[PDB]
Amino acid sequence: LKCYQHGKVVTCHRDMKFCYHNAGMPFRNLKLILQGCSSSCSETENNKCCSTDRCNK
Amino acid sequence: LKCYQHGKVVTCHRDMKFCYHNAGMPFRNLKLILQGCSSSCSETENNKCCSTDRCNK
Amino acid sequence: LKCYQHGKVVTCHRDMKFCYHNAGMPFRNLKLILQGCSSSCSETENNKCCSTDRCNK
Amino acid sequence: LKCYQHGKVVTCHRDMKFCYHNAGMPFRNLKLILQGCSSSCSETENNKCCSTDRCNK
């Protein structure tokens, strides 16, 4: 599996079967962006995971 | 597998075979702490993962 | 003005008239802790700011 | 003073005399972007602060 990871495409470890992408703003001037390979999402974050190459663009 | 996750103990998803704990300070007044279940660590973060119950305390 | 800043006590710059302390969980495994000298808070966070020495313990 | 703040232009509080913009990667999958009005920078980050309208694009 390959995933986007902040400007590059990376090959996942064999135990990471998903790509992930999520973002949040804890404060109006601070953005946090999570993006890369991952294991399964929580159910509440089900749509933040996908499992095909480069799907988390 | 069970891991600490910021004050609680959680049961990992079956595809998460590790517990993880890492911290960083991007600025002197900001601490980020990552703690919970995970998949395998990067080699550069090898000692941030462990694979026994509650090992990431 | 002096403020706590992650285990230490620091002297604020003269244009920073507040101390600040807040914590949150942008993601379930990620804890953010913001503590130290500060300029004025947003209106809704006015109680996270204080203006007396070491008030942000 | 007016500053960029993640896609918008905002007016600073009167005690915030600077605009700020910086980004970093605390962890390989985590990008942090800090942009908006600010008090004075740390000495080593003096070039991340500026004091003219919209200077932090």
UniProtKB/Swiss-Prot annotation, chains A, B, C, D:
It comes from the Eukaryota. Keywords: Disulfide bond, Ion channel impairing toxin, Pharmaceutical, Proton-gated sodium channel impairing toxin, Secreted, Signal, Toxin. It is found in: Secreted. The record marks 32 as: Key residue for inhibition of rat ASIC1a, probably binds to rat ASIC1a F-350. The record marks 27-28, 33-34 as: Important residue for inhibition of rat ASIC1a. GO terms for molecular function: ion channel regulator activity; toxin activity. This three-finger toxin inhibits ASIC channels. It acts as a gating modifier toxin by decreasing the apparent proton sensitivity of activation and by slightly increasing the apparent proton sensitivity for inactivation. It binds more tightly to the closed state and to a much lesser extent the inactivated/desensitized state of ASIC1a isoform of ASIC1. It interacts directly with the outside surface of the thumb domain of chicken ASIC1a (ASIC1a), but does not insert into the acidic pocket as suggested for mambalgin-2. Negative results: has no effect on rat ASIC2a, rat ASIC3, rat ASIC1a-ASIC3 and rat ASIC1b-ASIC3 channels, as well as on TRPV1, P2RX2 (P2X2), HTR3A (5-HT3A), Nav1.8 (SCN10A), Cav3.2 (CACNA1H) and Kv1.2 (KCNA2) channels. Does not produce motor dysfunction, apathy, flaccid paralysis, convulsions or death upon central injections (intrathecal or intracerebroventricular) in mice. Changing residue 32 to A: 2200-fold decrease in inhibitory potency of ASIC1a. Disulfide bonds join 3-19, 12-37, 41-49, 50-55. Belongs to the three-finger toxin family. Short-chain subfamily. Mambalgin sub-subfamily. This is Mambalgin-1. Expressed by the venom gland. Changing residue 28 to A: Important (19-fold) decrease in inhibitory potency of ASIC1a. The keyword Secreted applies. One of its GO terms (cellular component) is extracellular region. The keyword Secreted applies. Its main location: secreted.
